[PDB]
């Protein structure tokens, strides 16, 4: 949004037991994703990595090994309770990257502040044949 | 090859000898065919008939042909 929020590792995790489909060795070798939300009350939700957990009244922090799990939890919280969460990506060296609300308004909106990239300005089916682009390393859809 | 050249009707061609330490003694005895000293495979590729037709008769001719083809390769 106006200012990118900074994650807090001291935020309380939701009330949950032990997960089996949790973070593997990739969490301590490669990047892992961390989802934060602000629950106004305590309620039971379903994690994508196992059974069910109970979120605490306040900030809530969860860890996952895949971005798809983070976005699945985000859309579950948005559809079920309208929570509007946000997840960061933390690498092995501790670098933190802001992932979901890039402009803080969610990708469903526009905000008139994002530059559209990887947009072909020609119609589909007007691309050149693969014979035209041969021994060049450029795909017909990449021009 | 020479025995098949002498009698192309009765005795069967031999493809290659079998040396398998996993073979048992009845299996070794059962695979001794065509008047061989060990377990052999009956040839079905038909190179015996072809090499008899083109004029090869002796084993030395096959030896020199094989070494010449190895040199060619």
């Amino acid at each position: 949004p106006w200012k990118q929020p900074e994650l807090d590792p001291d935020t309380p995790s939701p009330i949950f037991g032990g997960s089996t489909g949790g973070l593997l060795r990739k969490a301590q070798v490669e990047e892992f994703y961390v989802t934060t939300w602000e629950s106004p009350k305590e309620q039971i939700f379903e994690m994508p990595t196992g059974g069910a957990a109970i979120m605490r009244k306040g900030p809530n922090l969860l860890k996952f090994a895949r971005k798809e799990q983070c976005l699945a939890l985000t859309t579950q919280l948005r559809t079920k309770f309208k929570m509007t969460p946000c997840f960061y990506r933390v690498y092995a060296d501790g670098k933190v990257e802001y992932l979901h609300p890039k402009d803080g308004v969610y990708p469903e909106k526009v905000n008139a502040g994002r530059v559209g990239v990887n947009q072909n300005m020609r119609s589909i089916g007007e691309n050149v044949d693969p014979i035209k682009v041969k021994f060049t390393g450029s795909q017909p859809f990449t021009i | 090859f020479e025995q098949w050249v002498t009698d192309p009707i009765h005795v069967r061609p031999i493809a290659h000898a079998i040396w398998d330490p996993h073979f048992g003694q009845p299996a070794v005895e059962a695979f001794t065919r065509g008047g061989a000293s060990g377990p052999v495979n009956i040839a079905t590729s038909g190179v015996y008939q072809w090499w008899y037709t083109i004029g090869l008769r002796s084993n030395q001719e096959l030896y020199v042909s094989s070494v010449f083809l190895a040199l060619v390769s």
């Binding site: 037991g17 032990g18 997960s19 089996t20 949790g22 973070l23 | -």
Partner: protein, 124 residues
Amino acid sequence: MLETPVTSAPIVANYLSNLPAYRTGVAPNLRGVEIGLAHGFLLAGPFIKLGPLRNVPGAAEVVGCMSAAGLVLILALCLSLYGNAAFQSTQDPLMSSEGWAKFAGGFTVGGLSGVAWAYVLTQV
């Protein structure tokens, strides 16, 4: 993350603590020697029992012992291959490259020693 009574048992914890792989109190050569001794001694077992020469007395134990030695050598070759092809890039010395090479050398030394010990025990 899911703690269990059998994984977090203190008896299981101290049984896995003093194992040669998880001791972290000795050089990799000694751990390899112990590993090779134990695994060669157990691997000689099925070879002196059900080999192709098991009906022939005397020669069955010898044939099983050389087969166990060959299996130990194959396992040592695969251990050396894993050490060379795993730790070729950047506190436990076992996870290092030359540490794993010394572990493999200890493993094959222990394997042949255990095969000889099993031969002595079967002869006696």
